[PDB]
Short mmCIF file of C-alpha atoms in Angstrom, two decimals:
data_model
loop_
_atom_site.label_atom_id
_atom_site.label_comp_id
_atom_site.label_asym_id
_atom_site.label_seq_id
_atom_site.Cartn_x
_atom_site.Cartn_y
_atom_site.Cartn_z
CA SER M 1 0.00 0.00 0.00
CA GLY M 2 2.82 2.26 1.06
CA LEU M 3 3.72 5.87 1.63
CA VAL M 4 1.04 8.38 0.62
CA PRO M 5 2.28 11.02 -1.04
CA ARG M 6 5.68 10.07 -2.71
CA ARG M 7 12.81 12.43 3.53
CA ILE M 8 11.54 10.14 6.27
CA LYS M 9 13.36 10.57 9.58
CA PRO M 10 11.74 9.57 12.86
CA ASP M 11 10.80 12.45 15.19
CA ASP M 12 8.73 12.83 18.37
CA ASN M 13 5.52 13.63 16.44
CA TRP M 14 5.48 10.27 14.66
CA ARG M 15 2.42 8.37 15.83
CA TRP M 16 0.96 4.87 15.36
CA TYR M 17 -2.77 4.61 14.67
CA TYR M 18 -5.26 2.13 13.27
CA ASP M 19 -7.39 3.41 10.42
CA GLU M 20 -10.99 2.14 10.51
CA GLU M 21 -11.58 3.27 6.92
CA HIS M 22 -8.69 1.52 5.12
CA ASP M 23 -8.76 -1.23 7.71
CA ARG M 24 -4.98 -0.87 8.04
CA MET M 25 -2.51 -0.18 10.81
CA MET M 26 -0.85 3.12 9.96
CA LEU M 27 1.88 5.54 10.96
CA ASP M 28 1.59 9.36 10.90
CA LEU M 29 5.02 10.69 9.78
CA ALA M 30 4.07 14.16 11.06
CA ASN M 31 4.90 16.04 7.89
CA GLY M 32 1.95 15.34 5.60
CA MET M 33 3.11 11.85 4.72
CA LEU M 34 1.13 8.87 5.99
CA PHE M 35 2.17 5.21 5.99
CA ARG M 36 -0.37 2.48 5.29
CA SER M 37 0.95 -0.93 6.35
CA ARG M 38 0.08 -4.29 4.85
CA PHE M 39 -1.78 -5.32 8.05
CA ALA M 40 -5.55 -5.30 8.53
CA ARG M 41 -7.54 -5.54 11.78
CA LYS M 42 -7.83 -9.32 11.62
CA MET M 43 -4.04 -9.47 11.91
CA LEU M 44 -3.40 -7.03 14.75
CA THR M 45 -3.18 -7.53 18.50
CA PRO M 46 -5.35 -5.35 20.77
CA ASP M 47 -2.44 -2.95 21.36
CA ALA M 48 -3.05 -1.78 17.80
CA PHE M 49 -6.37 -0.06 18.46
CA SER M 50 -5.20 2.51 20.96
CA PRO M 51 -2.96 5.18 19.34
CA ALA M 52 0.65 5.42 20.48
CA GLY M 53 3.75 7.49 20.16
CA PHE M 54 6.65 6.21 18.16
CA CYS M 55 9.17 5.74 20.95
CA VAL M 56 12.97 5.49 21.10
CA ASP M 57 12.71 1.69 20.88
CA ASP M 58 10.74 2.08 17.67
CA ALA M 59 13.37 4.50 16.42
CA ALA M 60 16.21 2.10 17.14
CA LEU M 61 14.36 -0.55 15.19
CA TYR M 62 13.79 1.81 12.27
CA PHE M 63 17.44 2.79 12.02
CA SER M 64 18.69 -0.80 12.39
CA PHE M 65 16.38 -2.30 9.74
CA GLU M 66 17.01 0.70 7.43
CA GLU M 67 20.73 -0.08 7.44
CA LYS M 68 19.95 -3.80 6.94
CA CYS M 69 17.91 -3.08 3.79
CA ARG M 70 20.05 -0.34 2.23
CA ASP M 71 21.57 -2.71 -0.33
CA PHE M 72 18.39 -4.47 -1.43
CA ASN M 73 17.23 -4.25 -5.06
CA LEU M 74 14.41 -1.90 -4.19
CA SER M 75 13.47 1.73 -4.73
CA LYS M 76 13.73 4.14 -1.82
CA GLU M 77 9.92 4.19 -1.38
CA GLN M 78 10.11 0.37 -1.29
CA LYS M 79 12.88 0.25 1.32
CA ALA M 80 11.02 2.63 3.64
CA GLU M 81 7.87 0.67 3.04
CA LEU M 82 9.51 -2.66 3.94
CA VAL M 83 11.18 -1.25 7.07
CA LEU M 84 7.96 0.33 8.33
CA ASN M 85 5.99 -2.88 7.74
CA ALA M 86 8.71 -4.62 9.80
CA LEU M 87 8.09 -2.24 12.71
CA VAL M 88 4.34 -2.84 12.41
CA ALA M 89 4.81 -6.65 12.36
CA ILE M 90 7.18 -6.64 15.34
CA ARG M 91 4.89 -4.40 17.34
CA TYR M 92 1.31 -5.37 16.46
CA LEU M 93 1.12 -8.61 14.46
CA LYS M 94 -0.59 -11.60 16.03
CA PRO M 95 1.64 -14.67 16.16
CA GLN M 96 1.45 -16.44 12.79
CA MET M 97 1.39 -20.10 11.75
CA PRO M 98 4.78 -21.46 10.54
CA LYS M 99 4.83 -22.36 6.82
CA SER M 100 7.12 -24.86 5.04
CA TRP M 101 5.28 -27.09 2.53
CA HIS M 102 5.74 -24.86 -0.51
CA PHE M 103 9.42 -24.38 0.18
CA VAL M 104 12.56 -26.36 -0.55
CA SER M 105 14.17 -27.87 2.56
CA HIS M 106 17.92 -27.65 3.15
CA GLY M 107 18.09 -30.48 5.66
CA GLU M 108 19.62 -28.63 8.58
CA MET M 109 18.08 -25.42 9.87
CA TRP M 110 19.96 -22.11 9.49
CA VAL M 111 19.22 -19.76 12.41
CA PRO M 112 18.37 -16.29 11.14
CA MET M 113 18.71 -13.12 13.14
CA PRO M 114 16.46 -10.04 12.91
CA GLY M 115 17.55 -7.81 10.04
CA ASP M 116 19.00 -10.70 7.99
CA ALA M 117 18.39 -10.91 4.25
CA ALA M 118 17.08 -14.41 3.58
CA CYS M 119 15.81 -16.56 0.68
CA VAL M 120 13.44 -19.43 0.03
CA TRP M 121 13.04 -21.48 -3.13
CA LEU M 122 9.57 -22.67 -4.24
CA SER M 123 9.27 -26.47 -4.33
CA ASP M 124 8.01 -26.66 -7.92
CA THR M 125 9.65 -23.85 -9.96
CA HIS M 126 12.74 -23.52 -7.73
CA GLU M 127 12.11 -19.78 -8.11
CA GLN M 128 14.19 -17.82 -5.59
CA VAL M 129 12.19 -15.56 -3.23
CA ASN M 130 13.85 -12.76 -1.23
CA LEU M 131 12.86 -12.11 2.40
CA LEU M 132 13.58 -9.84 5.33
CA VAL M 133 13.81 -11.63 8.68
CA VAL M 134 12.04 -9.54 11.32
CA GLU M 135 12.09 -11.99 14.24
CA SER M 136 13.56 -15.44 14.74
CA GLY M 137 12.60 -18.43 16.84
CA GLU M 138 14.22 -21.74 17.63
CA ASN M 139 12.34 -23.42 14.77
CA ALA M 140 10.89 -20.65 12.58
CA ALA M 141 11.35 -17.00 11.61
CA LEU M 142 8.69 -14.37 10.94
CA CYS M 143 9.69 -12.81 7.61
CA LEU M 144 8.40 -10.16 5.24
CA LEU M 145 8.49 -10.34 1.47
CA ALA M 146 11.48 -8.26 0.40
CA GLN M 147 10.59 -8.26 -3.31
CA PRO M 148 7.87 -6.29 -5.07
CA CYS M 149 5.81 -9.42 -5.63
CA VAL M 150 5.56 -13.19 -5.80
CA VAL M 151 2.90 -15.84 -6.23
CA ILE M 152 2.91 -18.79 -3.83
CA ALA M 153 0.33 -21.59 -3.61
CA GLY M 154 -1.60 -19.53 -6.14
CA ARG M 155 -1.99 -16.69 -3.64
CA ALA M 156 -0.36 -13.35 -4.46
CA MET M 157 1.91 -11.58 -2.01
CA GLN M 158 3.33 -8.08 -2.12
CA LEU M 159 6.38 -6.35 -0.68
CA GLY M 160 6.00 -6.18 3.11
CA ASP M 161 3.54 -9.05 3.49
CA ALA M 162 4.24 -11.31 6.44
CA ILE M 163 4.97 -15.04 6.47
CA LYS M 164 6.44 -17.27 9.16
CA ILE M 165 8.79 -19.91 7.79
CA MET M 166 10.39 -23.07 9.27
CA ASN M 167 14.16 -22.53 9.63
CA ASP M 168 15.07 -25.58 7.49
CA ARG M 169 13.59 -23.76 4.48
CA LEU M 170 15.65 -20.58 4.94
CA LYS M 171 19.09 -19.60 3.67
CA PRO M 172 21.05 -16.33 3.90
CA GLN M 173 21.15 -14.31 0.66
#
């Protein structure tokens, strides 16, 4: 969905809010720009529905992920959009169900860390898919799509969409 209208530096007037109309978690960038995340009400914890200030912790996350994504094959709007979706996922996303079936297994499990660039390959086409790890567990990592788009299991996904993936399916880029 992205940044509306086509800068971006966190300040104390940044504010998280859920938007009943677009049914999307959002961020007010306090300068006329608004961010519309990928995440609708059905995907958000109850913290999401009371507005909040972007805090130092949120700022640290923004700056860390922004450095992590600086070298991706993505426009600047796309990089900001992926990083901001990452902050929304970390902060407000309900825990997701681990996926694996549609992905090539590598036998052992690589353990990703937050910020890592990661890849899966689809079982049929062996098409490489680029991902941003946003949080990691002992067996699976919550990831966002770090490409403009991809089709998996016939469903379409866009840049910033969330998917949890078993670690044995994941490799570093």
